[PDB]
Structure 1
C-alpha cells in the first residue's frame, strides 16, 4: 500500500458530499419524405460549422487511409488528414451533411456548397 502526506485530491469523488448532504406534429409525422426539407427553403446557415469541418476531415481522412480514390492532384502529400484538407480547400469532397432539426426534419447541405469560412 501507500502512506503519503502529500494531499493529492481525490478527483471524481463527489459522492462523499452527496452522502453528507442527501436531504433537502403539424407539418411532419413518422419518417415520410416530408422529413426531407427541400433545397429551396433550407433555413440553416450556409457556412460549414467547426464540427462539420472536423467530421468531414475525419471521415475523408479515414477513407483516404482506407484507400478511397482522391479527387485532387497530390503535391507529394502523404498524410490523409492534409490530403483531406486539400480536398476541402478546392472542394473535392463528395459528401453531404444531414443537419437534423430538433423536430426530426433534416436539411441536406453538400460540402461543395457549404462555405468554409473558418
Structure 2
C-alpha cells in the first residue's frame, strides 16, 4: 500500500551520515546485548568498533525505511546502500 517496489526506488543509493550513525548505534547496542556477530572478531572488543567492522563488510542485518513527505516509503537493506 505504501511500500515501493525495488525498481522505482528514486532515493539516493548512498548511506547518509544520519543513517550510518543510527545504524552503527543500533548495531552496537544490539551486540552489547549479546547478539550474534556476523564478522570474525579478531582483536577488538568494543561493540562500536565491531559494528563499524560489520558496516564496512556489508554484514549488518538491518533495513532503512525512508519515509517520503507523502507518507510512502522505500526499503533499503544496509548491504545494498553504498558506504563511503
TM-score, normalized by the shorter chain, greater than 0.5: yes
RMSD: 0.5
Deviation at 1:37, TM superposition (A): 0.8
Q: What stretches of structure 2 of length at least 5 have no aligned partner?
A: none
Deviation at 1:76, TM superposition (A): 1.6
- 2:74 maps to 107
**Does residue 47 in structure 1 map to residue 11 in structure 2?**
no
- The number of residues matched between the two structures is 84
- 1:79 maps to 46
Deviation at 1:96, TM superposition (A): 0.6
Q: Which residues in structure 2 correspond to 1:22-41 (within 5 Å)? A: 34-41=1-8
Map Cα deviations across residues 16-67 of structure 1 (whole Å, 9 max, x no partner): xxxxxxxxxxxxxxxxxx2001111000000000000000000000000011
Q: What TM-score results when the alignment is normalised by the length of structure 1?
A: 0.70
**Does residue 70 in structure 1 map to residue 37 in structure 2?**
yes
Deviation at 1:75, TM superposition (A): 1.4
- Report which structure shows greater RCO (CA 8 Å, sep ≥6): 2
Q: What stretches of structure 1 of length at least 5 have no aligned partner?
A: 1-33
